[PDB]
Design a protein around this nucleic acid. Structure first.
Lengths: 94, 81, 108, 93, 94, 107, 98, 82
DNA sequence: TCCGATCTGCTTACCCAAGCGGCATGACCGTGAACCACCTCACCAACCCACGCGTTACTATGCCCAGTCGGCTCTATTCATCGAAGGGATCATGCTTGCACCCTAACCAAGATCGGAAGAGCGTCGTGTAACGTGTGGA
DNA sequence: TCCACACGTTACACGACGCTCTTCCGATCTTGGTTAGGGTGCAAGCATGATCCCTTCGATGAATAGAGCCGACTGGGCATAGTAACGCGTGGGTTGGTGAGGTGGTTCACGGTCATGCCGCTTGGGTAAGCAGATCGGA
């Protein structure tokens, strides 16, 4: 049994070496179609549009998690917390 | 479509954070991150829909999403040009 | 056209099209008129930037024992060069992945 | 329709730099997107510069100054040198 | 010896309509002119890009309305859209 | 000819002729319709009226009958829509807003 | 037996005073000389409009005040009230300036 | 007139005043040099863009509008000077 | 007795408020004029609208296994508390230099005037590029 | 082993060629205006030093909750077929935006000029911080 953190580094290396999408195709598509239901009813989506939305969302989330990890390390911690996310979003401009 | 935000599962958030270089994760950052993610989408999709509604179209093309992302200072290369 | 059609891209010794760039500058509604040397300069700059990115991407692809540039190699080339990274700082490259950088504090 | 793209020119440049290295269709699309983005950036900056001085023509000076403003550091210097070389080779027949 | 057109006559008529007993300093006048010019440039650029993306060579009320919807946030966009629609209706009514 | 009433009075508004002229000689489009200047002038007038009303309210709260850059900054940053619109904008002589983090306050 | 304020009180008074005011905080002549010295590496024998130097000073002070706000937030995040160079570096890293 | 070592004219009290306007209660003694370096970098970028704008117009005096355009290029619009 | 809180009771700098110069600073009249917005007729091309057709977006079905969900262990991580010491705050002195203000001479931005090169725009056309088809090799 | 890419072939449409015509750009001159530099006075904000507090950092220990492992389970992705919603193209009509020529209304600029809003200065009071003193809970 690996100690807590040994497999975390392996996962970090595996998911930084790779380049595939991390969120599943169908749940994200349903989320996008549900979010777009408050702006225009009976709205159709292109496949490339949903793919582009998924790439943009995952890139934004990865950048946000990088900033959140930077903030958490700044506070003498390795565990990222919602306060780190809030600080990163405030400093960034959101 | 009802309550599809919970489709962004805990393992998906964990994988996204692992790609971001995060070693340990607090249990309360999932329900937070999802919200943040939704907010991001609630912006981009909105602009995309507007770009569609100006063109008298129904299908949200990939170029609408590309222009919406370019509006917010996040250019996306590879889709539609 | 009594004389043979010599493309302006061959006159400037470029590979990118100066006629297409001139047409885009004219019909793109940037000014009332565009000079003759503006498409040439813009095409030269575009060709230089493309050559730089392609050279770095080819080096990255050769480092990975691959003989075909994919978006991952483009992202690696962009992020590993300070000038290109500063230039393409806000853009996201589809299927480009993330640079493998782990903070030293988290390491054992 | 007849959609236009920089695919053939990007491929020519790639064959010039790396003789025996191909390029993926998605990678070529990303290259075309980058070329279009930089073209629009430089053209917009040149238009703004021309309008600031109450001019009406984007000549090579506006493009050179836009290149100086946009590209950072050594990239700007080398792009300016390459553009000047191309424009001084073009006017000499 | 050169004309310098500015939005100083018109943001004082608006000020006297809103607050009939309040002046405005020269520095605030310059800031208001800069704000009006910046908003004009933003809306005009957004409308120009919208017309170019649709392969159009005109800027009608639709392009300006879409630009206002894109830039102005929340209730500001709705109120500005209502004001613009009312002004256009008044203009084409006479 | 005719009595030649301006477009700014036909629409009930800010100039419409000047906005049309800037739209034409700003190199935005090949042609400019007759609804673009009116719509844009109306939008600009609405935004100016909103910001001027908020600035005047701030001035009245400050007991001064003259809007200054500080009043404009207070009006812009005290609203949410205006702070979202002009978040990335610096105002000369506008100062900042009197906020202090709760941690720094005395125990 | 002089009256000495406890530490942190005059700091709060100065915070209130400098957030209630709008004037420029950097001295005008030293900043003008700094701007002229900086502009020497780009062009020799340059001239500066007074409004140009004033605009440069306004922009620099606004940028530094915003950076100090972000730095204070980053310091309070680390359970401290004293702002260090670490907070400035983190604020500029998250903002996307380094 | 050749100017040298004027970055020290952004004195410690001036940085203290800027921090107090920023809402800072305590200041580490080593932050003044970091702030001076940050200010020098920002001024270098803005002044370089302003000088480029000026020399494009074949001018020798940096006007206020050149600084305004440079700041707009940096992404921080300035209201008050044009 | 005893000890740390807990009022409590002066002091004591600090800031906000009110009133009197007094001043420079907008608002406005008064021309004045240079500008340019408005009116009107030609017109032609961008736009509108109906119709056709082929993508392609959505739907329904089957399944299966890799991914997900939940629980159990437990141990690395986080948080609370103490000591302290030194890093930073606060205040008194002395004085350096930025601020106020005027002259000058140099220097440069703005306006006028050829007049010559240069870019739009016309018509022809003949290569270059995209669009498709099919072998074939890089992952 | 294969499905994405790199070689043809066609065909058409758009960049190049030539010429006209109009319109900017460079050279040159002139003139006001507007900084850079220099000079003096001074007073106030900066530099330095003393004193001291309370913030932050290291140590130590509790506690806690997230990572790792494992069993159950179940829906995302792949394969298949079907159907119509709609995006793009095409052709004919049409209407409205540009261009040109007058023509006065708007607007900018320069000069008082004048209330007059606001600032400097002084005075006065509300106020909250700060330290010494008396008291009070239990021990």
């Amino acid at each position: 049994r690996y100690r807590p953190g040994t497999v975390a580094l392996r996962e970090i290396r595996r998911y930084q070496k790779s380049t595939e999408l991390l969120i599943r195709k169908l749940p994200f598509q349903r989320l996008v179609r549900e979010i777009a239901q408050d702006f225009k009813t009976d709205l159709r989506f292109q496949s490339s549009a949903v793919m582009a939305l998924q790439e943009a969302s995952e890139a934004y989330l990865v950048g946000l998690f990088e900033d959140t990890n930077l903030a958490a390390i700044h506070a003498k911690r390795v565990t990222i917390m919602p306060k780190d996310i809030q600080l990163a979003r405030r400093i960034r401009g959101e | 479509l009802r309550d599809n935000i919970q489709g962004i599962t805990k393992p998906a958030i964990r994988r996204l954070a692992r790609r971001g270089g995060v070693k340990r994760i607090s249990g309360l950052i999932y329900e937070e991150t999802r919200g943040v993610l939704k907010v991001f989408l609630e912006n981009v999709i909105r602009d995309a829909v507007t770009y569609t509604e100006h063109a008298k179209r129904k299908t949200v093309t990939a170029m609408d999403v590309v222009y919406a992302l370019k509006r917010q200072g996040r250019t996306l290369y590879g889709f539609g040009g | 056209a009594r004389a043979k059609a010599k493309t302006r891209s061959s006159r400037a010794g470029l590979q990118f099209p100066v006629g297409r760039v001139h047409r885009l500058l004219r019909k793109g509604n940037y000014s009332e008129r565009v000079g003759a040397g503006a498409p040439v300069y813009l095409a030269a700059v575009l060709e230089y930037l493309t050559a730089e990115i392609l050279e770095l991407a080819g080096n990255a692809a050769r480092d990975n024992k691959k003989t075909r540039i994919i978006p991952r190699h483009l992202q690696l080339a962009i992020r590993n060069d300070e000038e290109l990274n500063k230039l393409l700082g806000r853009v996201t490259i589809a299927q480009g992945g993330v640079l493998p950088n782990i903070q030293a504090v988290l390491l054992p | 329709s007849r959609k236009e793209s920089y695919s053939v020119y990007v491929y020519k440049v790639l064959k010039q730099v790396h003789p025996d290295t191909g390029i993926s269709s998605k990678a070529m699309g990303i290259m075309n997107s980058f070329v279009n983005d930089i073209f629009e950036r430089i053209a917009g900056e040149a238009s703004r510069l021309a309008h600031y001085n109450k001019r009406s023509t984007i000549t090579s000076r506006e493009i050179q100054t836009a290149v100086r403003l946009l590209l950072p550091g050594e990239l700007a210097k080398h792009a300016v040198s390459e553009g000047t070389k191309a424009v001084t080779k073009y006017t000499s027949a």
